[PDB]
Write an enzyme that holds these catalytic residues in place. Structure first.
Site, PDB file in Angstrom:
ATOM      1  N   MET A 103      53.294 -24.749 -77.653  1.00  0.00           N
ATOM      2  CA  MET A 103      52.399 -23.748 -77.087  1.00  0.00           C
ATOM      3  C   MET A 103      51.657 -23.059 -78.236  1.00  0.00           C
ATOM      4  SD  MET A 103      52.422 -24.002 -73.858  1.00  0.00           S
ATOM      5  CE  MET A 103      53.310 -24.258 -72.301  1.00  0.00           C
ATOM      6  N   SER A 104      51.568 -21.734 -78.234  1.00  0.00           N
ATOM      7  CA  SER A 104      50.721 -21.062 -79.216  1.00  0.00           C
ATOM      8  C   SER A 104      51.220 -21.044 -80.660  1.00  0.00           C
ATOM      9  CB  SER A 104      50.422 -19.629 -78.774  1.00  0.00           C
ATOM     10  OG  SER A 104      49.395 -19.609 -77.804  1.00  0.00           O
ATOM     11  N   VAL A 105      52.422 -21.551 -80.922  1.00  0.00           N
ATOM     12  CA  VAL A 105      52.778 -21.801 -82.312  1.00  0.00           C
ATOM     13  C   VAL A 105      51.748 -22.776 -82.896  1.00  0.00           C
ATOM     14  CG1 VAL A 105      54.489 -22.811 -83.875  1.00  0.00           C
ATOM     15  CG2 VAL A 105      55.226 -21.290 -82.037  1.00  0.00           C
TER      16      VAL A 105
END
Lengths: 384, 384
Positions: A103-105
């Site tokens: 995801m947003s990592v």
């Protein structure tokens, strides 16, 4: 028009191949070697039900850690102290070298690629986005600087209500191929980004996934490489990773820079190791010492008005696609929904990777529990 | 209704997740670890323009071989003599350990999985398809035996005109997710298969990809495993392969048994090695000696009326998803469109893998050239 984009393969026409043309020549020479980019595909394992629990030393200091990991839907957990893996956990059904969506990592990886190009003087953060992507003229990205994209300090009309098909968040997902297309939808991510508007104000943090895909678009215009290839060339290939990462691609082959990367926990930890090594990876320097210092130093505190963050981290901030806690350990983390963290603990020269699947993308409850685990583990690494 | 199918993951509802639900709990715990099964995805290489040419000894006997490989759009070429790789070629842009779509060579892998289950007495080739898949009652597969599916001796109304969207071949592709869905299309491959009709006659060879997907469906009903997992458990995991294979999956997670497998050339050669070792692989027996003998012996010659095959191989035939040339070397081959071969040369204890991308799926011209190469290479391996 969204202008020039990197061809899917050498000599390819714009936008080719599609799901309906990949079998046709000349596309098929490329597609036959990369079919997963076109058609959903499963792994057929070359290898022939129980959790792997190797929590090492910290187990004594945190006796209930396995239960705490279970309670926060942990799929993979790994602690790297210096160069040594000192704690590991993988749930039943998830192998140590299985890959997991970040995801947003993913955003922190994209920012790192931008950083490399800033080091090379190929990107000037002070310059407007339109210096690199003229076709964003007339959009909310007409006016703001690349640094303001990096720090997400642009006011954007971007509805995050994912139960509304008309919302920007859902439209972004359909444009990226994460959900079924609806009539009227933009053709691809580039087109979606050009539709975005805002009141023109900047300076206040607004977390928005569109920002990261704009950064990837800039990367493509500056290098001429597909973002998929740029992410490999400038970052992944320098890590000496165990496995390739993967990244979802939209119909043009544009990788979902903001959220679509998957990799193993051990390999993600190599990114954190690079950050704590001043930007150097095993196969060469990734980013400059200066870039890493700026990430660790944090962003403007005044800009950070998200109480979902500051309630826990009063002195927190955001810069260059990283969350900076501003706590007494100066922890910095990549963060993604449903419980993904690439957590940096410079005090102990350690990296904590936690990859999870909470039932909910976000609640205060989940973040309290997750941050409690990451902080307890960090402190367990302190000399005593 | 198409009856019970293997769940995408333990406890999953029928047909779940879809492209529109994979982010939701409880699906997301599985999907986050297998996202490529839902959304098109690209590899981000962990490794940092020239053909690799190692044609070994046969180079002297076939001086123009590289040119001949280029002319037939060769992507990967490998000769395994006994246990030794004695010749290799990979085109510029294709790495030795890159994977390549197998097209209908996939069928020979599926037949091998069926063979394992026949050995175990879990499938009786003499029994009607409906003994294992009752839901195919009322279709062209109501009446024929499993062996008749294996040998493709069922008359089926299956239009192979791929320029006509209404054709069975195109409808099959859309049902498998290889092309964009059209209104009215069957929901998945299982449903597509139930729509097939024929005049009821059997005994004459008719090459039809529907047959192989029926075999995979039988495999699923007998074992309770997703075909993807069955292909791994009964074949791929026993090979000691360098890499996983991959296989495209339709919206239910059903692997495209008839054409959707990709793997490396070296790993495909391990399948041929197993066949020439009487059915034994490094990690255990895959199929019985008897099964292998029956494949090598060939099918009914009377049944084989495809002049596209018999013009070159007058005494040729087809059995258990393999093409049998019936030539003086008794060569047997898996074959796929655009130039894929898993070619067996028992005389010299050798396997030839050729993976290609001809611009056309089939012409007499391409097959003349390709078969000329495979035969010349086979003969070059003869003792002199």
């Amino acid at each position: 028009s969204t202008g020039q984009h990197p061809a899917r393969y050498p000599g390819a026409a714009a936008g080719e191949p599609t799901l309906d043309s990949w079998q046709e020549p000349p596309h098929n020479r490329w597609a036959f070697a990369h079919l997963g980019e076109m058609v959903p595909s499963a792994a057929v394992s070359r290898r022939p039900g129980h959790a792997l629990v190797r929590l090492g030393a910290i187990a004594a200091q945190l006796p209930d850690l396995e239960q705490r990991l279970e309670q926060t839907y942990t799929d993979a957990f790994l602690v790297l102290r210096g160069t040594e893996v000192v704690a590991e956990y993988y749930r039943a059904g998830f192998a140590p070298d299985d890959r997991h969506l970040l995801m947003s990592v993913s955003k922190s990886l994209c920012g790192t690629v931008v950083g490399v190009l800033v080091d090379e003087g190929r990107i000037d953060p002070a310059q407007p986005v339109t210096e690199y992507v003229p076709e964003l003229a007339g959009s909310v990205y007409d006016g703001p600087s690349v640094l303001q994209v990096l720090d997400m300090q642009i006011s954007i009309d971007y509805n995050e209500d994912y139960v509304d098909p008309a919302s920007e968040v859902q439209t972004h997902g359909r444009s990226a191929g994460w959900s079924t297309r609806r009539h009227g939808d933009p053709a691809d991510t580039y087109e979606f980004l050009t539709t975005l508007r805002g009141d023109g104000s900047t300076g206040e943090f607004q977390y928005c996934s569109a920002n990261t895909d704009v950064l990837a678009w800039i990367v493509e215009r500056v290098t001429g490489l597909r973002y998929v290839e740029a992410l490999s060339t400038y970052l992944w290939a320098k890590l000496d990773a165990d496995r390739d990462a993967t990244i979802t691609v939209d119909t043009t082959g544009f990788g979902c820079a903001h959220g679509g990367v998957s990799c193993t926990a051990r390999d993600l930890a190599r990114v954190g190791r690079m950050m704590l090594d001043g930007g150097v990876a095993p196969r060469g320097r990734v980013v400059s010492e200066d870039w890493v210092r700026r990430v660790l130093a944090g962003g403007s505190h005044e800009a950070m008005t998200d109480k979902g963050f500051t309630n826990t981290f009063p002195d927190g901030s955001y810069t260059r696609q990283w969350w900076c806690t501003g706590n007494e350990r100066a922890n910095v983390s990549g963060i993604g929904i449903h419980g993904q963290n690439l957590w940096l603990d410079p005090l102990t020269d350690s990296v904590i990777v936690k990859l999870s699947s909470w039932p909910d993308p976000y609640t205060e409850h989940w973040h309290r529990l997750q941050n409690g685990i990451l902080l307890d583990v960090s402190r367990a690494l302190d000399a005593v």
